[PDB]
């Protein structure tokens, strides 16, 4: 066509030509002769108000891989008709290819596995852009150290070296650790790292007391790395500790660091070595029992927990585990009786009603579970040191949130209040943050939710990605509602 002469025909005749030129373009597109584009341009010169011509041009650029031209032409289609289905999906498809996942998800949302694919791509892009010196929550630290005999651990620092200038700092580190307080863990973490650095220097005139104190510093600085999820850092120090002076703790800790869902043969051989070094050490049996428990080997778990109990009968944790095993074995009555007998011995410890409340919740006795968590919270408030920390708040808030919308606005507000308090009392709890974030999102407090989801991701690899995913999904909802 000479478009010169066509443009000077009538409006019926000029449009008629558009339908005719468009159709010629379509013939070529079907014949994989995309350079189609020329005929559509011709059509545009006669009818620039037709979004089909721009949308068709963009289908050609999809076919030849010009992703930037796809965006330009689908955009032109969409500026005429913002709800054009093919333009929206083509533009989302090209944006995904260019790595503009939020733009893709936006158009896919307006259009309505594709959404989910781009969400994942966005979460990994953001996780990779973003990404430890950060401890787990004080609640989780108190639980981890609950089995150990503080006095024994603090007194295991040797005061008799002629060269050791770090032992007093090491002693303060352990003192702080076993105070089981928010300040205690932060100070322990600081001073263990400092003691280890001093020990590396000292090791380089050395004597055996200094070697054993170094092994002790290395052993705890190692488990702190494990707790921070720096597994290689942990293994390096634990191995150094073993190379200096083998101890049951260093074997327990190295086993935890190298634990393997596939083969648990190595885990159990470390524990045999720990047993050999000291067959009269309660935490060895307790931790091995924990692993048999996790592997659902209840007979062997019971044996080990009974051994831990028989070596340190003043520690509440072996009793609790034994009661939990009864419940898992299919014996609630006997479990409840064991918890009650344990509550008689340890009437001030919140560990007993907190673990029992978890069993009640599993049974669906939510009202009794909440009463147990109420008691646990009061017992916890009265103690100087952390026992169960924010566990009861999270426990009760989770029940109340699920009961509220299964809206009971009083239970839902109560849950918010509980999780808000939990977040303030234990700022490094990702559990508390994510819990609160989901409720904020239900209330359409999107900005608040996003901040909580993002903090949780800082705090939490698959966990970091899950939190990042919640945050990125919420940012898209925010963008949609903004327009």
């Amino acid at each position: 066509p000479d478009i010169a002469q066509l443009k000077g025909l009538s409006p019926s005749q000029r449009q008629a030509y558009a339908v005719q030129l468009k159709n010629r373009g379509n013939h070529f597109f079907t014949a994989k002769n995309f350079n189609a584009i020329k005929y559509y341009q011709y059509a545009i010169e006669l009818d620039p108000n037709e979004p089909v011509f721009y949308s068709n041009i963009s289908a050609c650029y999809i076919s030849t891989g010009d992703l930037e031209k796809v965006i330009e032409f689908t955009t032109k289609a969409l500026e005429i008709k913002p709800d054009h289905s093919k333009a929206l999906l083509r533009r989302a498809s090209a944006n995904e290819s260019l790595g503009n996942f939020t733009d893709a998800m936006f158009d896919l949302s307006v259009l309505s596995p594709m959404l989910e694919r781009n969400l994942n791509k966005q979460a990994m892009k953001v996780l990779n852009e973003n990404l430890s010196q950060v401890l787990p929550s004080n609640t989780s630290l108190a639980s981890f150290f609950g089995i150990f005999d503080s006095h024994l651990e603090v007194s295991s620092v040797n005061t008799s070296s002629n060269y050791d200038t770090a032992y007093a700092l090491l002693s303060d580190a352990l003192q702080r650790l076993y105070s089981a307080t928010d300040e205690g863990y932060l100070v322990a973490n600081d001073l263990l790292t400092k003691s280890t650095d001093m020990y590396h220097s000292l090791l380089s005139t050395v004597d055996d007391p200094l070697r054993e104190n170094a092994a002790l510093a290395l052993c705890y600085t190692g488990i702190f790395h494990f707790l921070k999820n720096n597994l290689l850092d942990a293994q390096v120090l634990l191995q150094e500790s073993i190379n200096l002076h083998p101890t049951p703790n260093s074997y327990i800790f190295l086993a935890l660091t190298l634990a393997d869902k596939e083969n648990s043969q190595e885990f159990f051989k470390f524990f045999q070595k720990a047993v050999d070094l000291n067959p009269e050490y309660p935490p060895t049996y307790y931790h091995r029992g924990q692993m048999y428990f996790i592997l659902q080997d209840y007979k062997n778990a019971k044996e080990d927990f009974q051994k831990a109990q028989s070596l340190n009968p003043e520690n509440v944790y072996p009793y609790i585990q034994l009661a939990c095993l009864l419940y898992k074995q299919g014996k609630f009555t006997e479990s409840e009786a064991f918890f009650n007998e344990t509550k008689l011995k340890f009437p001030t410890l919140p560990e007993v009603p907190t673990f029992f409340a978890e069993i009640l919740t599993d049974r669906g006795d939510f009202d009794t579970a909440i009463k147990q968590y109420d008691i646990a919270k009061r017992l916890e408030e009265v103690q100087e040191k952390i026992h169960v920390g924010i566990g009861p708040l999270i426990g009760k808030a989770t029940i109340l949130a699920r009961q509220s919308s299964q809206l009971d606005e009083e239970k839902f507000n109560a849950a918010i209040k509980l999780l808000t308090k939990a977040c303030e009392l234990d700022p490094r709890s990702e559990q508390a943050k994510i819990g609160l974030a989901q409720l904020k999102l239900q209330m359409e407090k999107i900005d608040e939710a996003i901040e909580l989801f993002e903090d949780s991701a800082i705090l939490a690899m698959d966990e970091k990605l899950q939190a990042t995913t919640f945050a990125e999904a919420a940012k898209i909802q925010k963008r949609l509602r903004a327009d």
Binding site: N26, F29, V52, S55, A59
Partner: peptide
Amino acid sequence: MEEVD
């Protein structure tokens, strides 16, 4: 969705 109109 891959077809011209």
